Design a protein around this nucleic acid. Structure first.
Length: 76
DNA sequence: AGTGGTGGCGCATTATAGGGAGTTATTCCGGCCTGACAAGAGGAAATTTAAAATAATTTTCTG
């Protein structure tokens, strides 16, 4: 449910909700496999971080038909 | 009048941005081949003038 909770943010960037939740699942798995409890870092933040890092990356890249650099998106 | 509470700083934790490294892909820099000019040579068509002949003018001779 955490992935679902964070996903509902990105809900209008030309992306089927389910694709969003899927990208979030990939990011969460990546965080879990990379999560470090011994490095000294709040687990939940680490997770959510990766979640966003994946979701925003996916929307930036595959949202628009003509793919556009991400810094350009930030400019917009 | 004392024990706790408040604020500020410290310690520990948390979050965010920039820089370095890579990597790709566009873009500048240089040599070398095309392309243009200037010249030179040998041989051949064209043009011009001089000389030689037919058809007309002038003079002379004949009827």
């Amino acid at each position: 449910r955490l992935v679902i909770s964070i996903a509902k943010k990105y809900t209008n960037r030309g992306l089927q909700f389910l694709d969003l939740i899927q990208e979030g699942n990939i990011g969460l798995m990546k965080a879990v496999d990379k999560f470090e409890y011994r490095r000294g870092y709040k687990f939940s933040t680490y997770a959510t971080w990766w979640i966003r890092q994946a979701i925003t990356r996916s929307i930036a890249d595959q949202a628009r038909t003509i793919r556009i650099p991400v810094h350009m998106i930030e400019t917009i």
